[PDB]
Amino acid sequence: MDLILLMLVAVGLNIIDIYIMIEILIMGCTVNTIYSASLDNDMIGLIYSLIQIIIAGVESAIGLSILVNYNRIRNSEEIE
């Protein structure tokens, strides 16, 4: 069911919904890293997992700021 690109329907029809999809996709990689590190008893993989969480948080902030300013520009006359 994945090869027919079923996930393209589960994503909503708003720009912020695309942002949510990216966070979920990146979160799946981090969960996989924790899964492998825990089985191996490897703290190096848990270091990688922590880095992925911190880096993904930075990505969300930058993307939101661009989207905030993009919404600001349209409602920017502010004559009142």
Binding site: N32, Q52, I55, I66, I73
Partner: protein
């Protein structure tokens, strides 16, 4: 030098008052920083010492002669770009003040230069993910530096989403390699190069192919380059390719150890499509930056053929091609920024709107450049004929060396296709030359008192006032003659490329 000086500039810029003059002088400070960085790097890093390859910072980074050459190229090209914002490009306040409006312009560039230089040096999958995001985030900020521009913010929104998906693919590939092997250091992974899924590295390359606008992911790159300001498009369309292509060559160098034929075919398939879209795509377009975006896609495809072959001749071909293409890229965008002073002023059909961010936006805005400035027009013609591949310009030798690597490794189909694509792309390349000069003899006896340059006041009616500032005109003059007169020193330059080794030794 970069990191320490960046912190000082960050604090200093926020302390002094907000003004165009201080921002321009701060931009010159950034120019000195990059120049000092180049001097320090050249003092300690040499080609001979780095031939073996030296690990750094607990083997997280690995520098060799191949990596060092690109870093030196990155610093040099960044110096030429800062000259645009550190000096006048047209001499007119209404046009030039855009570069001096944003104080964080030089700060964001210094952030990206750190990412660009460290990316080819990555030796761990963890630091690979960290650095690729460091470079990607800096590009998003630079694309959105003009936050009062609707197109600039829209492009950055597009850039963020496409790059984030590519970063996820890159992260997904590295995580899958860790699951199979449990190791994060690349050199440790090379011990198991014959026991890991080699198509996981193809997933890694797919993320890198997105970040360089390769087909089928070309569409976002063309849209972003056309909408972004010319001063921003000049950076974001060249700098990411300097570092990512170098990293792709290293990854392909490791992949060729197992020599997976299926891996080569998939990359060949993407190169074949990129040559089709790169050539036929630019045939029917009216924007100059849209035309250059297709030109960028086509030339990256030519370099990828050298990268895919990954042999001794590929090192010579790639190093030469990336250096000469960057110089041609700088020269063309430098001329485009300057020639905005020859635009006629209305004093209407098609209701054409031109903004201050992209004064030159259409190919036909280059009309009568042969009459307006014969030396600048010839400089553009030399650059365009280099992209075509007319010998003995720098462009011909780049394609000549790429063909050598492609045909030596047996890529007969791609070599023939790249030459058909070159002929097809010559059509839109020649269109630029047609606009510049083909109406010279009919418009020689014409009067133009409505040009932008005509609005510039004179000093005393006796001073010989040049139309162009000293710095930008000198850079165009230097780059044009290097492209034209490469035959004089071609033999020695290739000998320098002979000594760039990626673990060849003997």
């Amino acid at each position: 030098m970069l990191f320490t000086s960046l912190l000082l500039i960050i604090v200093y810029g926020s302390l002094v008052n907000k003004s165009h003059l201080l921002t321009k002088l701060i931009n010159r400070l950034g120019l000195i920083i990059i120049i000092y960085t180049l001097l320090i790097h050249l003092n300690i890093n040499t080609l001979e010492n780095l031939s073996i390859g030296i690990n750094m910072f607990n083997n997280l980074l690995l520098i060799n002669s191949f990596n060092n050459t690109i870093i030196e190229l990155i610093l040099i090209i960044c110096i030429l770009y800062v000259l645009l914002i550190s000096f006048n490009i047209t001499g007119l306040s209404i046009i030039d003040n855009l570069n001096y409006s944003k104080r964080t312009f030089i700060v964001i560039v210094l952030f990206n230069i750190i990412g660009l230089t460290l990316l080819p040096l990555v030796n761990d999958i963890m630091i690979l993910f960290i650095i690729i995001e460091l470079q990607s985030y800096s590009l998003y900020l630079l694309t959105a530096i003009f936050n009062e521009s609707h197109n600039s913010t829209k492009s950055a929104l597009y850039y963020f989403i496409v790059g984030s998906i590519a970063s996820f693919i890159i992260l997904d590939a590295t995580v899958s390699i860790y699951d199979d092997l449990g190791l994060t250091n690349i050199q440790y992974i090379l011990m198991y190069i014959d026991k890991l899924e080699i198509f996981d590295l193809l997933c890694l390359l797919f993320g890198l192919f997105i970040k360089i606008g390769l087909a089928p992911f070309y569409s976002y790159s063309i849209t972003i380059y056309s909408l972004s300001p010319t001063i921003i498009t000049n950076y974001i369309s060249l700098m990411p390719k300097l570092s990512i292509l170098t990293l792709i060559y290293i990854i392909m160098h490791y992949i060729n150890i197992v020599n997976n034929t299926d891996l080569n075919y998939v990359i060949s398939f993407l190169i074949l499509i990129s040559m089709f879209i790169g050539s036929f795509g630019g045939l029917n377009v009216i924007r100059i930056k849209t035309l250059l975006a297709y030109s960028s896609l086509l030339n990256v495809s030519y370099m990828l053929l050298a990268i895919l072959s990954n042999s001794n001749e590929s090192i010579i071909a790639y190093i030469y091609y990336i250096i000469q293409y960057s110089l041609t890229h700088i020269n063309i965008f430098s001329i485009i920024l300057v020639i905005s002073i020859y635009l006629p002023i209305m004093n209407n059909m098609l209701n054409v709107m031109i903004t201050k961010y992209s004064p030159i936006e259409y190919i036909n805005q280059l009309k009568n450049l042969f009459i307006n400035n014969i030396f600048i027009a010839i400089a553009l013609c030399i650059s365009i004929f280099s992209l075509i591949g007319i010998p003995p310009l720098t462009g011909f030798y780049g394609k000549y060396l790429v063909l050598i690597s492609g045909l030596n490794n047996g890529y007969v189909l791609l070599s023939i296709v790249l030459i058909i694509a070159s002929s097809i792309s010559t059509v839109y390349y020649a269109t630029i030359l047609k606009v510049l000069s083909f109406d010279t003899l009919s418009f020689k006896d014409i009067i133009s008192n409505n040009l932008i340059i005509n609005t510039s006041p004179e000093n005393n009616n006796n001073e010989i006032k040049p139309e162009i500032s000293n710095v930008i005109s000198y850079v165009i003059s230097s780059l044009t003659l290097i492209i034209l007169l490469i035959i004089i020193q071609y033999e020695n330059i290739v000998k320098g490329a002979y000594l760039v080794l990626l673990y060849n030794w003997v």
